[PDB]
Amino acid sequence: MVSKGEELFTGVVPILVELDGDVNGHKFSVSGEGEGDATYGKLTLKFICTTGKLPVPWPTLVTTFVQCFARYPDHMRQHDFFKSAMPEGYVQERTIFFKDDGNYKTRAEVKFEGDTLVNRIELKGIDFKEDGNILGHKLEYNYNSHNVYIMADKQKNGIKVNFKIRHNIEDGSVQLADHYAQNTPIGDGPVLLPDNHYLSYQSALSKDPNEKRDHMVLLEFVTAAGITELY
């Protein structure tokens, strides 16, 4: 049978993203809108910096900007924590360590407000180099494919997630961003605590030729894998 959480994602769902950030005292806000299609693992989102110029590179915010939209194969449905927490939602806590630079700490609440899936985020960055790759805007406007590794944390009724992002630097080198996270349900009801598995991500960044505000257009596909003799 289809669970309550699963049922909320059977069609295309509107998404609203709202972020308030402070990186080395540079304060900024971003709003985003678009939609998610969990059957395809597909996100289509446009983000605007509503406070003016974004003080960090757009690519450094991609991972922060709704894992409930991952495509989970039918055979992996019992391992989809994110949809199981809906509609009440979950809280994602992350730390992102930029190698040889500062770190972001984020807290995101992911939940439905009516028919809209909302990703509401606070981000705090400290210890950045004012002329490094982040505050100096030395990162290319592109994005590599990565795997994201998920394990249960039964004690906390949630999951732990870790992965490495490699951001391309304009000189051909790479800026590593080591991610560590916890996701915990907001509600008090049962959730699905998964066996170890991963999500496979691919992401494409673009610009809207008619948009004069500082912005990012994101197309992202996300598929669960790692748990699999019928043939």
Half-sphere exposure of 201 (CA within 13 A, CB side): 23
Closest among 69, 75, 67, 86 to 190, alpha carbons compared:
86
Q: In this structure, how many other beta carbons lie within 10 angstroms of the beta carbon of residue 52?
A: 10
- Split into its structural domains, the chain has a count of 1
Q: Give the C-alpha separation, 4 to 192, whole Å.
A: 12
CA dihedral 87, 8, 37, 30 (to 10 degrees): -30
Alpha-carbon separation of residue 86 from 37, 61, 122 (angstroms): 15, 24, 21
> How far is the C-alpha of 134 from the C-alpha of 100, rounded, in Å?
11
The secondary structure element, H or E, covering residue 48 is: strand 42-49
Q: What's the reported resolution, in angstroms, to a tenth? A: 1.2
Measured CA to CA, the distance from residue 9 to residue 140 in angstroms comes to 33
E strand or H helix at 4, and its extent? helix 4-7
Q: What is the CATH number of the domain that holds 47?
A: 2.40.155.10
Strands (E), 85-157: 90-98, 103-113, 116-126, 146-153
Residue linked to tokens 């969990």: 38
Contact 152, 159 (CB under 8 A): yes
Sign of CA dihedral 204, 10, 156, 224: negative
Find the angle CA(20)-CA(56)-CA(101) to the nearest 5 degrees: 110
Residue 75 amino acid letter: H
Question: In one letter, which amino acid is 179?
Answer: H
Q: Which domain holds residue 94?
A: 1-231
Phi then psi for residue 84, to 5 deg, are -65, -25
